[PDB]
Design an enzyme around this catalytic site. Structure first.
Site, PDB file in Angstrom:
ATOM      1  N   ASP A 144       0.771  -1.015   0.077  1.00  0.00           N
ATOM      2  CA  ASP A 144      -0.178  -0.079   0.031  1.00  0.00           C
ATOM      3  C   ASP A 144       0.739   1.049   0.130  1.00  0.00           C
ATOM      4  O   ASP A 144       0.777   2.360   0.493  1.00  0.00           O
ATOM      5  CB  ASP A 144      -1.174   0.433   1.313  1.00  0.00           C
ATOM      6  N   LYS A 200      -6.703  -4.665  -3.657  1.00  0.00           N
ATOM      7  CA  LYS A 200      -6.707  -6.156  -2.288  1.00  0.00           C
ATOM      8  C   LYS A 200      -8.360  -4.421  -1.305  1.00  0.00           C
ATOM      9  O   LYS A 200      -7.857  -3.208  -1.437  1.00  0.00           O
ATOM     10  CB  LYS A 200      -6.433  -6.569  -0.778  1.00  0.00           C
ATOM     11  N   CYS A 236      -2.217  -2.749   7.665  1.00  0.00           N
ATOM     12  CA  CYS A 236      -2.423  -3.370   6.257  1.00  0.00           C
ATOM     13  C   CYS A 236      -1.002  -4.870   6.350  1.00  0.00           C
ATOM     14  O   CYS A 236      -1.215  -6.128   5.969  1.00  0.00           O
ATOM     15  CB  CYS A 236      -2.511  -2.734   5.326  1.00  0.00           C
TER      16      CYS A 236
END
Ligand SMILES: NC(=O)NCCC(=O)O
EC number: 3.5.1.110
Lengths: 222, 222
Positions: free
Chosen positions: A23, A132, A165
């Site tokens: 990310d 995702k 995450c």
């Protein structure tokens, strides 16, 4: 390859390993992105970008698969779940846009600046770029299938957020029998500094291994 | 029913919810058990045990299913995974028994004192007692099936450790679209106190809700 780590050194084969960049989007790493707008501190992520660039260069040259994650959803947030999903109630991006309606559609939305990988981090041919819809890269995605199809058992984690995450994906990797190593200086937490310390403590103590970018790059040199 | 919680109150139907008691075994709660022998502080769990007793009595009277987890393996540790599993290399129980062969076959071993639920906590007919081989109750078990079969969407968590088995199960519950609440005074961390604070912070901020036993019991009293 032997990699010095906490709580002890570990062995991995780079050809059977993957470097996961979690990310590294403007939302999580750039001023004006979601995390910054939501009230999290992003003033310290610049060194994380450079460290990930270094780790990526080393990993690719050693034959490791590079996987880039982008967290987020369609611009209408159908993929975020409606009120029947806990993600609708927990997502701080959704909470921020319910508080600031001029933001609506701009945060973590495919096709938006917020959702893009930061300008400094450019996936190369042969890398895999995976979307995702939730914090963990191992739920609702083909990540496990991608890794198994290549016989990969070791995962080297970088990215943001360490406690969200990154840690969720590493924890779920452990439950899927992957050996996970986090490069601590190539990560950044969402929250106070204790959330970084606690994430690394939990990984080192229960779930995996903690190393750093320089040690990683030195280990890959041969 | 409304349950006051952090970061905000939530609503749920107790008969569509489950109270999960995570790993209240001597291993995790009792002096001389695994965690104590592994160097973790277990000296303050007596209030946790009492609070779990109070929560279970309230949940059962409200028609909420009670699920008790027991973490561990066969006494030969086949179920812990061999050297090909990260669990073999991370498990602090296995590490302790490697250093202390007198304890080989005793820690987290089905049928043993370490594995037994603490004396104070006695499952009743109608409760479900679930063994699990890894930290998260959602991997390698019928937990998701059990809950879906009953239309359960809300999970109320208690037990040990807050940052390990409790948090992992809650996070995985979130990824399976369950609404998870942790009763903070009915949990205890494995590690320094920052690990408790950080687990509650991660849950409250990203994954679910935090409440306490007395608030929970008062919510069920109508
Ligand atoms: N904190 C914790 O759950 N330790 C248990 C790990 C093991 O199974 O050895």
């Amino acid at each position: 390859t032997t990699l010095t780590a906490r709580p002890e050194a570990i062995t991995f084969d780079p050809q059977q390993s993957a470097l996961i960049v979690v990310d590294m989007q403007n939302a999580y790493a750039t001023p004006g992105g979601y995390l910054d707008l939501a009230g999290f501190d992003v003033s310290t992520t610049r060194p994380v970008i450079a460290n990930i660039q270094t780790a990526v260069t080393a990993a690719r040259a050693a034959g490791m698969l590079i996987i880039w994650f982008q967290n987020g959803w369609d611009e209408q947030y159908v993929e975020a779940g409606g009120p029947g999903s806990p993600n609708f109630h927990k997502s701080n991006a959704l909470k921020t846009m319910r508080k600031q309606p001029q933001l609506q559609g701009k945060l973590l939305a495919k096709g938006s600046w917020d959702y893009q990988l930061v300008d400094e981090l450019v996936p190369q041919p042969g890398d895999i770029v995976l979307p995702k819809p939730r914090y963990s890269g191992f739920f609702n995605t083909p990540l496990d299938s991608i890794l198994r199809s290549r016989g990969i058992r070791h995962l080297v984690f970088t990215g943001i957020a360490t406690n969200v995450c990154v840690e969720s994906t590493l924890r779920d990797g452990f439950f899927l029998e992957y050996f996970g190593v986090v490069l601590e200086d190539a990560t950044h937490q969402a929250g106070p500094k204790f959330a970084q310390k606690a994430a690394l403590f939990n990984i080192e103590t229960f779930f995996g291994w903690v190393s750093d970018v320089e040690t990683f790059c030195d280990a890959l040199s041969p």
